[PDB]
Amino acid sequence: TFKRRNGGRNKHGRGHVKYIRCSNCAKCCPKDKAIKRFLVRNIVEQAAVRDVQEACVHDGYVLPKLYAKVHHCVSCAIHAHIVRVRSRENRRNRE
Amino acid sequence: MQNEVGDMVDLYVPRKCSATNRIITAKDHASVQINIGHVDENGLYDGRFTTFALSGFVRAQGDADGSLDRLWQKRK
């Protein structure tokens, strides 16, 4: 019983994909099988933006954003609810 | 068909698709029998029409429109 056309990963034209480390557990999963999100998160949340912009020394300053690109494996993704088991039909769309 | 005596033994010699010439079975419910009326002159109709048979195969292909077009380019 085959569950996915691409196998769960998107490798076509290759035979080998260099692997990466899960950010949670450090399981080794190939780069193009790993649930990759690029999250860009403010240093603070919106209860802590004015209390730092009324304490920034120089007026007109803008907060940075944590740009980082986290990698996860399938186990840590399912466990963290980054992704969910979708129905047989709904499983097929990519948006 | 014709027996060697003179009789004809089969039942309802079937009709054929006019686009594919495949014969239309007795359970091909996707088959149509169009009727195109003839215009003559003032009045532009009389009970005189040409008839076409289209099979389920032809319709499901999507060329059933093209078949009617290129068959109703027939002149008399």
Partner: protein
């Protein structure tokens, strides 16, 4: 001199926004889409549209009993068009949404054995098309240039996504059915005016 009925009616269809198809085309009806404006949008050969309009008119007028014909639209642009088409041609319009089984479910309250089915959009009315495919129901459909023409016998290549197009198309089929049945005597004077067909939005 004068002008032919071709000429009047093609002026009608140009001004009524019927030459402008969609962004793309389907192989089953690139035999109509004439060229491309650099937008990418295609333009339909109205000569072939009008030839298929006669073809559809003949196919309609070949029915002995006009009460035995169904015309339908699921688009919210064509309800007025189809209702008036029925009130003028003696058809039996079924506007709005189609109850699955109107054609095959012999013990449904809404039952109908059309000798012919007319569909404003082969896309939206994809339910009646398939249903006809079970009941031997020839089908005349207004195929826009992105139409699945599967199970479509007589497909008029004609834009059907503007406020004017569907009304215009049904006014042309209306007049040609009436002319062929002779109910309006020769002479291009037909006393029913076009803006009746275009829908009135409350």
């Amino acid at each position: 001199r004068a002008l032919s009925q071709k000429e009047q009616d093609i002026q009608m269809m140009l001004a009524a926004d019927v030459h402008l198809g969609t962004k793309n085309c389907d192989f089953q009806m690139e035999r109509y889409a004439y060229k491309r404006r650099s937008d990418g949008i295609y333009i339909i050969n109205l000569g072939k549209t009008w030839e298929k309009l006669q073809l559809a008119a003949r196919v309609i007028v070949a029915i002995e009993n006009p009460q035995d014909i169904i015309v339908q639209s699921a688009r919210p642009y064509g309800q007025r068009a189809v209702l008036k088409f029925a009130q003028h041609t003696g058809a039996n319009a079924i506007a709005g949404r189609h109850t699955p089984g109107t054609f095959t479910n012999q013990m449904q309250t809404s039952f109908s054995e059309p000798r012919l089915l007319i569909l404003t959009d082969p896309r939206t009315d994809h339910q009646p098309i398939k249903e006809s495919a079970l009941g031997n129901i020839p089908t005349i459909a207004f195929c826009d240039t992105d139409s699945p023409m599967r199970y479509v016998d007589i497909g008029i290549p004609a834009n059907n996504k503007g406020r004017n197009s569907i009304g215009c198309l049904y006014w042309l089929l209306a007049r040609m059915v009436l002319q062929m049945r002779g109910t309006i005597l020769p002479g291009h004077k037909w006393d029913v005016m076009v803006d009746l067909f275009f829908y009135r939005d409350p």
